[model samples]
Every structure is written in C-alpha cells, then in structure tokens.
Target: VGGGRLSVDASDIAEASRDFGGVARAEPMAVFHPRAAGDVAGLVGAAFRSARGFRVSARGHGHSISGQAQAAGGVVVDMSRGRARALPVHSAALGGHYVDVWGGELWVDVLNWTLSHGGLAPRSWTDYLYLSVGGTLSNAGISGQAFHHGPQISNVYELDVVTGKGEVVTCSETENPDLFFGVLGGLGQFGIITRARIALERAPKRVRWIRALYSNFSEFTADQERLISLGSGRRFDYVEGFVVAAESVLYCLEVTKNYDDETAGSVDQDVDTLLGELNFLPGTVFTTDLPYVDFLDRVHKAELKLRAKGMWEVPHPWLNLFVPASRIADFDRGVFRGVLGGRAGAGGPVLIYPMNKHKWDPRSSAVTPDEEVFYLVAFLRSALPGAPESLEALARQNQRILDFCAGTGIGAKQYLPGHKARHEWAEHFGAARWDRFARLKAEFDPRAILAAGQGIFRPP
Candidate 1:
C-alpha cells in the first residue's frame, strides 16, 4: 500500500526464480515490484514481523552467477520496475558532476542517457554494460580504468539502502558512515540499494583504440603493470590484457586513449609516445579510432552473436580470482599454463592483468589482494544446455583451480558468486575480517531476511 504492486502467480514466481547464471534455481512465493523506498520498507517490516520464516531478496537485472539474486520460498523485490525515470546530471564540468540512477538501471542505459543528455559519464565500468546498478556495486565493479579511477564502487558518491529491519536510510562517507561503507561491497548482506549517486567525468567525444600481441608471458605482464602504474597524466584512459598460448599473449593486450572530436594525426603524437614503449610483436600493432560509446558497448555486439547461436542461455561455470602481485606469474605458470595447458577455450577467453591496489578504498566491504599490485584472473566459460555432465565437469574444473590456489598459498580472493560454506568464506576473509562482517550482518540484518541466494547467512 505504501508504494508498489505485488504478484503471486505461477508465472511470476517461476520467472523470479531464474537468472543469468542458468546453473541454479530457487523459487520465491511472491514478487514485489516496489515503486518507492517506503514500499520496500513496508514489505520488509511485514516480513520482519511474520512468525514463520520469511526471507526477501531485492533483485536488479539478476546477472549474478549462481543464484545470488534469488529468494527461496519468500519474497522477491523487482527493483527494475521504476527504472524508466530520467537520470539527472548535476554540477557539469566544474569537477563535480554526477547522475542519480536507480539501482535497477542498466549501465548501458546510464551510458546512453548521460552521454546524450549531458556529455558526461562514469569514470570506471564493468566490461558488460547490461548489468544493474546495484548488482555491480554489491561486488567491487572493476574495469580497465580501475588502475587509475579505482573500482566502480569507489566512484559512487552515495547510496540509499533499505535496511533489513524495514528502515529507509541514506548512506555515504559523511552520512551513516558504517552502513555507507558496509553496503558498498557488502554483497547485499546488509541492505538493498535502491538508488546511487554516481560520480562522473567529462565525456570523451572519441576514442583511440589499439591492440597488440605479446608472445612472452612475463614481458606481457610486466608491460601491463608498467602501463597501469604510469597513473594520471602519463597513462592511457583504459588498460587491460588477456591470455594467449598455443592456448591463446597470455596474445592481445588491449589499451585505449580517449579524446574529443579530433581528426587523425592530432592524437598521433600522444599515441606514438605511448606505443613507442611497447614490447609487443612488430606486426601485431593494431590501431583504430571509434566514438567513445562505441568502444564501451563493443561487448554487447558479442552477446548478440552468442544469443543467435543459442549460446547465451547456457550454464556459465565461470571463476574469478584476485592474485597478489607477487604470485600472479606463479599462478599463471602453475594454473593457466600448467594445469589447463592448451585447453583454455572451453567457453570464452581467459583474462589476466594487473591493477594498482592503492587506488582502492580499504574501508569498503570489497575484498582485494594484500599486495600493492594485483591481477584479476578470470576463466569466463559457458556450458551447453543439453550437456548436463559437462557442466558438472566444468564445476569440478573450477574446484581444482581453487584447490591449486589454496595448496600453493596463493591466498587469492574469489570475487563474487563465491564459496557457500561458512568456514570457507571465513578463510577467504580471515578470522578478524570475517568476525566484523558477521557482526555487521547481525546489526543490520538481524533476522537474515535479505538475499537468501547469496548463502552468506541462514535465517535464524
């Protein structure tokens, strides 16, 4: 009655149970489409008061791996219902510009509206733009620009979260401090983020994109770290690298420099200055320029082709890891080159690149590598629908990788959609950090009424 509508039907419940992971399912009894924060508060309050076990999970685009967005036999809040509202940009070009976006808003829509209306956009972003605002911020959203701008979570100025206790609270560094930092990368353990104030930078009119191949893994990674550490004025706007063996430069190390509506040769000197330092293969230096938005939305085109081939709905047995800078090469040699050998193409490309750790905020709930520099090693894969046994095998493969990381003392942190066992999760966070996390969960979500699919806690 406060703000939104509800649905309780077989079709709605069935739809709410599924998500992008396509590997798991958990049906909710009812689906709530909240139009305002009060609507969410009211429902959560009712759930909080119920005698029987009642849980709720606020789902955005549900792009998470596994069932991280589902609610088992409880309530599912469809945050995307009111997402069509206009995103307003403020403080343009004065070093303080931002857009207030709904947690359900897609990054692709944000990019379009921000650029078209205000000629400004977010500084850091995930490679895939279709993800929901809350979904990415729940984990630490990393992209090529993370080396300089930090993760997308660090770029957010404020968030409005509805606590599990059914209270509407606004949080920021200067506001509800603990809840602010707690909910940023809290994995939806504390509350549901309904809105965010995302910081923005002047939008680049065009982009100078370049790619080059590197044969030696060591040289490739060394160049990546060097490029990322160049920082601020000296480095390119976006930087990332991927694996290449007889398996795939551990071949193409991607980098880009952004500029405004400049014709050729204008940014040639800048490109030359940056490119001259490369150790890539002589014939592999590829260069091109496209509109800035075109460069960002490039992956959406890949998704279209996959959907056409029926590959989009397949089970994704993906695994992501944060390797300390000291152990990245070792992890690569032992895991990538040794364990898998030449079999890196089960689903999609493997990625490996270093990021500066100092750029990250230590206080947030997002976990990171312990060292000053670290790498995001990802095994992005998809398993066909009819092949049930292969999906299990792929799952086993992921476990083996985790085993290897643990056995070798890599101490790597699994990014999102991670370990389900409580003890295993504790090990990932260490004894002290784990204690703090659990305490915060009790403080904010005492009944553990949110995000049952995350498996971080169980209802009391």
Candidate 2:
C-alpha cells in the first residue's frame, strides 16, 4: 500500500516545499503526483482509514509567500493538472457570461482561453496572472477590479471539490451550500478544488491607463477612494494605486489609458490638482494608451523582464492586509510613513487601493470590513540582490507592521495568511472566526491532516 508509481523522494519534496515567497520551508513525508481526481480521492481515503493522521495538500504554481500550500510530515498533492482542462463559456440569465476552468489553471491561461473562445473575460484579477485558480480562490484573489466585481472568490459560482470523506462533489449556492461557501476561502480546510465556474463579461476592446504621482499619502488615498466609489459611469473601469518609498524616487506613479475615450480630458480635476500638490520630482509623470487586453495583461511584460533578470525566483515577503476605510488615513500616517519610510531599505511596491465590501459574499470564508468600503494594502517586499542584511530583518519588518496594526486596533485581516508560530495563527484569526474555522476544520478534516504548515491545527 505504501508503494506507488507517483511517489517522489526527499529531494523532490524539498524542491516542492519551497514556494514563490521563498520565506518558509518544510519537509513533507512524500510528494504524490495524482493523474486524475480518482487518484486524489483514493489517496485521501486511504489516509483517512489509516488513522495515522497523514495530511494532504495541493500545490499550484507555488506563488504563495506563506507555506499555505505546504504539508509537513504528510502527503503533498501537486495539482498542476488542474490547469489541463479548457475553459467553457456559458451565458447567464443576468445578461453576462462566465467561463469554467480547472482549479490548477493559471489566470494567464484562463484569460487567453476566455478571450479566444467567447470575447469574454473575468471582471477582476490580481496584477500578476501567473497565480493558479485554486491558489487565489483560497484567499479571495483581488486586484484593481475588486471594487467593481468583488474578489475572485466572490465572482465564482460553482466548484468541483474532493471533500475530506473522499467524495467528488459539485457545490454551488444551492447545492451543498455549506461546502461551497466553506471552500471559497477555506484555505484547503474543507476540500481541494478541481474545477471552478467564474462569472465573466463582455471584454473591453481597449483601455486608457494613466498614473500620477503624490507625495502626500492623504491626497493619494482620497482620490483613489473617490474614483472607486464613482461606479462605471463616473470612473475608470479599473482602479488601483501603490506607494513607493520617498528615497526611491525612481518608482513613480503609473497609469494606463486603454480606451480612446479616456484621455487628458477625462482626467478628474480634483485628481489632477491632487497630483500637482504632491512632492514628486518634476516631469516624472507618465501615461500611455493600449488595447484593453494588453492593459489587462500589462504586468506580464514586467514579469518577463524580471524572469530574465532572475529576480522572479527571489524570496518575496509579500504581505496583503485589508484596512477599513475609516482607518486608512491613520494606517497610512502611522505605518506607511513611520515604519516603511523610516526603515525604507526592504520590500517592493506597496499597493494601496479601496474595495467595495458590498460586492463580496459574506458566506465565504474570506472576511472583510463591516462597512461598505475598505482598502487592500499589499506589501510586495523582496530582499534586494546581494543585500548585506539577513533575511530576518525583512521578516522583522513584517512583524512590526502587524504589531502596529494590532496595537492601533486596526480592523485588518491578512491575505494569503501565514504565521511564524502556532499562537500567532490563533491571534490572527481572533477568537470568534477561529472557533467556526476550527469547526469547519473538524467537520472536513477531523484529524487535521492538511496544510499543517499553516500552523492552525494539530494532528489529531
């Protein structure tokens, strides 16, 4: 029973355990490459019957900073096969359409498939499309379009998951609703997703992308909030912003204008003035127009460049947090300026943008603000090449940010969450959600035999 044609050794386990984040590493008992859903079910069922508390976890593109995909001293199910299925377009009663994709598929592949087959596309996405369907769905995948369409998890309609009992079930709002809601942002606690049906819409032919600089954090955030709240009739289809260190003058504001309608004329007067009042060096402002598809996949170009430079594989201490709208200014004033500005030597671009909580689904495990709106602040930090300091410094910086958020009573939640230790994991979820989350964990994986690297559950 222990022998299998698909098993890999310690060397393979070591390589598979390291994720894109390059921060945390674990050693799994073995890595299993399941050819089909049946293989996954059989493996899981056998593990269940053994009563030895063996865990199973899925690995997508290994893009996570935290070891959410890692399973220590247990089985790791590599789901790269999730991307093998082609996407199918289906018309909706509400006048839009959606595409069905395998859970292991990358957003880049999905976008291409959707565009080529039906002239449709996902309403929202992260800036980087290389992330897998299951990976992002596990954490409420988000980006500029989140304000308009909600996070990626909110946009999904149905999922094909292999449950803890080894059942291959198709769940939706009406079918196995608890499982549906639980798996959306359940972090592999309830099941492993094999397929997903995502809502889509008519693709935009072009876009007008633009960027403006702002030294004043208040002005930057204020304009971002106003634009996101304006809706389709009043603002750009996409809305997102980022903050760079004061010393890093080279990293300036960037905006893309993809539509012919969007131009210097469409630029908001208040936004223009807001930029004018900032402290960016003169003539750093830049703008460009491109086809809508090109604009949507703009990050792909940068990704290619980074890959060529070998920076893509470097350790990334990415931190994503949702700050309530009421405390956004306070967050910026305290953390952004204090920790980031004062200690500005680490991390990459700091993404700051607002999202509409009204559009998100509360039933899903992905939690958000109680208010109508909130902000997603992503700190995509990476160790500078040949840097003299130890990586611990970067990790400490992340801790400091979390400490400030906790000390100040900021209603924030971690995106693609990870913890250095078990206690911190409990503290991050707090008492209320932790209990329910644990309940779901108990129901699905009573033995707590999955994602052990998450530090949330213990072997039964």
Report lDDT per candidate: 0.83, 0.74
Candidate 1 is scored at a TM of 0.96
Per model, state how many residue pairs clash.
Answer: 6, 18
Candidate 1 Cα outliers beyond 4 Å, as residue runs: 82-94, 245-250, 262-265
lDDT tens per residue, model 1, 399-430: 88888988999969988957888888888788
Record all residue pairs in model 1 with backbone atoms less than 3 Å apart, i.e. clashing: 242-250, 243-250, 244-248, 244-249, 244-250, 245-248
TM-score of each: 0.96, 0.88
Q: Give the top-scoring candidate (TM-score).
A: 1
Q: What tens-digit string does per-residue lDDT give for candidate 2 at 368-409?
A: 755688888887877765663646678788888889988998
Cα lDDT over the full model 1:
0.83
Scored against the true structure, residue 152 in model 2 reaches a CA lDDT of: 93
